[PDB]
Amino acid sequence: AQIGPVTDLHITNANISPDGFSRPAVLAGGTFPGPTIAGNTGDNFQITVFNDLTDPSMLTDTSIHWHGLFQKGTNWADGPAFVTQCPIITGQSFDYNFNVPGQAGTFWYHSHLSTQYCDGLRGPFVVYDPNDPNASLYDVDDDTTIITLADWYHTLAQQEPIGAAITADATLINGLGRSFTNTTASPLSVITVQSGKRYRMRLVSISCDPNYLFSIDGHDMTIIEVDGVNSQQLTVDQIQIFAAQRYSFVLNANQPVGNYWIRAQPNSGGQGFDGGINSAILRYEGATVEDPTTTAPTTFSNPLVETDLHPLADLGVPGQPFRGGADDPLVLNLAFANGRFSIDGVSFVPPTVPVLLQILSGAQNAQDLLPAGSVISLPSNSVIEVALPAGAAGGPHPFHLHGHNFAVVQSANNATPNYVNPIWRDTVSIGGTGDNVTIRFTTNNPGPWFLHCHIDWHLEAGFAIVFAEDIPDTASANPVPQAWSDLCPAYDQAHNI
Numbered sequence: 001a002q003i004g005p006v007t008d009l010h011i012t013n014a015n016i017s018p019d020g021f022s023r024p025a026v027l028a029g030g031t032f033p034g035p036t037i038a039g040n041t042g043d044n045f046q047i048t049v050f051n052d053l054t055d056p057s058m059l060t061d062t063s064i065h066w067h068g069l070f071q072k073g074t075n076w077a078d079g080p081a082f083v084t085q086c087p088i089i090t091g092q093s094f095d096y097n098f099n100v101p102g103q104a105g106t107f108w109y110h111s112h113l114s115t116q117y118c119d120g121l122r123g124p125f126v127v128y129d130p131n132d133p134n135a136s137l138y139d140v141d142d143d144t145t146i147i148t149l150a151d152w153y154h155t156l157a158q159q160e161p162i163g164a165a166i167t168a169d170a171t172l173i174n175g176l177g178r179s180f181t182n183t184t185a186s187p188l189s190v191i192t193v194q195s196g197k198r199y200r201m202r203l204v205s206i207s208c209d210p211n212y213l214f215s216i217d218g219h220d221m222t223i224i225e226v227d228g229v230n231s232q233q234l235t236v237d238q239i240q241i242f243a244a245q246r247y248s249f250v251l252n253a254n255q256p257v258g259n260y261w262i263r264a265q266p267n268s269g270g271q272g273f274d275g276g277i278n279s280a281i282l283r284y285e286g287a288t289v290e291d292p293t294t295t296a297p298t299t300f301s302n303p304l305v306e307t308d309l310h311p312l313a314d315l316g317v318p319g320q321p322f323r324g325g326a327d328d329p330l331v332l333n334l335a336f337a338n339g340r341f342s343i344d345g346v347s348f349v350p351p352t353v354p355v356l357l358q359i360l361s362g363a364q365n366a367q368d369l370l371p372a373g374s375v376i377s378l379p380s381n382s383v384i385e386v387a388l389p390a391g392a393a394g395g396p397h398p399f400h401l402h403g404h405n406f407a408v409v410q411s412a413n414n415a416t417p418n419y420v421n422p423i424w425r426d427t428v429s430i431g432g433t434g435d436n437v438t439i440r441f442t443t444n445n446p447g448p449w450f451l452h453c454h455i456d457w458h459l460e461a462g463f464a465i466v467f468a469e470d471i472p473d474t475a476s477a478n479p480v481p482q483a484w485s486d487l488c489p490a491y492d493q494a495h496n497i
């Protein structure tokens with residue numbers, strides 16, 4: 001029941017009750033989470049998105065981002081509203097037609113208009129590798145081995161009141177889970193394994209906000225992939241996974257046939273597992289159909305620490321092995337005050353004309369691009385370093401860069417940089433007060449690429465900038481289809497802009 005790489009995808013409103021509480025939602029493919037979109041490395045994806053939304057309480061416009069896919073030469077297909085496109089209006093469709101050269105791993109897709117993905121438009125996106133270097137480490141890798149972690153809210157995203165704290169009402173694992181308050185014994189998700197087999201579990205955070213402490217009672221987890229990047233095997237017994245991150249891990253079904261709790265503890269909302277909140281079930285074939293009776297340890301023996309991860313391939317780190325050892329070394333001032341986030345003193349407010357369209361129309365430096373102060377040019381064929389010092393309220397903030405992955409030269413909670421063999425990824429926690437999480441990449445992908453906190457409430461409140469990478473080559477690199485050119489006139493007509 002995976003779809004793609006060539007598929008329609010209808011976006012609709014419907015009622016759902018994933019924790020026993022009914023509310024309307026914004027859904028892809030009629031389900032929460034949406035169906036898995038899948039193909040093989042190098043494939044041409046043609047995802048024709050039909051906007052069938054009618055309920056304005058969750059916005060009737062939409063736009064979909066394919067998280068972690070580089071979109072080289074297809075910046076127009078990336079999805080962030082008012083960065084690479086105007087939204088698709090109701091009753092219309094749009095073909096996101098792109099290729100995935102050189103990428104294979106675990107990704108996801110989500111609305112990228114306002115806070116709409118929180119209302120339900122989120123699902124997995126898997127790019128398989130027929131020649132996966134990790135293939136011999138497991139036996140089973142299919143739709144039954146994808147594990148999604150989601151926050152779920154009873155209040156609609158657009159209806160979250162100004163000036164009140166936002167927390168979720170349930171953790172959903174594979175779309176099911178129990179509410180933190182007024183808990184009812186609604187069904188839990190079951191992940192089934194066969195004793196003796198090995199599984200590539202593809203763990204996807206589709207969170208709008210919380211990070212999760214993920215574990216499986218009785219089991220450990222051997223990480224083999226981080227945000228699309230193959231890793232050396234790293235065995236852990238708990239994974240702290242931030243919004244939008246992905247891991248693959250090998251699960252060896254090497255415990256007695258039985259039932260084991262799967263745990264996903266968010267950093268906000270309900271604490272613990274009373275009544276089966278924050279929980280799913282790992283069930284071995286042949287086990288009794290009953291809840292697990294296992295318990296977590298008080299202290300985990302081998303939690304994931306990001307500096308322990310290393311690429312499988314020899315990826316290195318571009319630039320020179322010291323702070324500022326890049327062609328374009330940046331340090332962003334990330335702040336929060338009075339309900340708004342800012343980067344270098346500017347709070348992001350989406351522009352009327354998408355940044356890509358401004359560039360195609362001839363705006364050719366970043367000072368000419370709107371929003372003023374929110375678009376930073378990057379030079380072509382250059383090593384970029386971005387330091388992201390933490391401290392802004394609401395952390396730890398998982399920062400994400402479109403169009404690229406990056407070397408994590410410095411991770412949370414550790415002052416020592418790594419210029420030799422750090423993991424590469426696309427979404428990174430910037431940590432806690434006094435940290436200096438730092439990323440590096442090379443600019444070989446012309447176009448405007450969003451950089452933002454992936455806590456969607458923080459993005460909405462301005463925690464973003466756009467990197468206009470290689471403005472001079474953006475138009476030649478990214479030819480646009482007529483349907484894309486038609487989006488802004490249709491949107492602006494519909495909205496009387």
Ligand SMILES: *[C@@H]1O[C@H](CO)[C@@H](O[C@@H]2O[C@H](CO)[C@@H](O)[C@H](O)[C@H]2NC(C)=O)[C@H](O)[C@H]1NC(C)=O
Pocket residue numbers: 323324329330331387389434435436438
């Ligand atoms: C994080 O690292 C960056 C460099 O990657 C530091 O930036 C330097 O900041 C000082 C002022 O604080 C400037 O004088 C330098 O020109 C900056 N660049 C360098 C040294 O390469 C930044 O201070 C660090 N931030 C924290 C909070 O540790």
Ligand SMILES: *[C@@H]1O[C@H](CO)[C@@H](O[C@@H]2O[C@H](CO)[C@@H](O)[C@H](O)[C@H]2NC(C)=O)[C@H](O)[C@H]1NC(C)=O
Pocket residue numbers: 305307308414415416417418419
């Ligand atoms: C803090 O981060 C540093 C840098 O990533 C880690 O240092 C590396 O540690 C490994 C394992 O002992 C060594 O092989 C490397 O040579 C170290 N690199 C550097 C640049 O020092 C360090 O382990 C991390 N600290 C903790 C507590 O995990």
Ligand SMILES: [Cu+2]
Pocket residue numbers: 065067068110244400454
């Ligand atoms: Cu994303």
Ligand SMILES: [Cu+2]
Pocket residue numbers: 065066067068400401402403
């Ligand atoms: Cu993205």
Ligand SMILES: [Cu+2]
Pocket residue numbers: 394395396397398453454455458459463
């Ligand atoms: Cu944030």
Ligand SMILES: [Cu+2]
Pocket residue numbers: 065080112400402450452
């Ligand atoms: Cu984004």
Ligand SMILES: [F-]
Pocket residue numbers: 066067068069070401402403404426
């Ligand atoms: F991305």
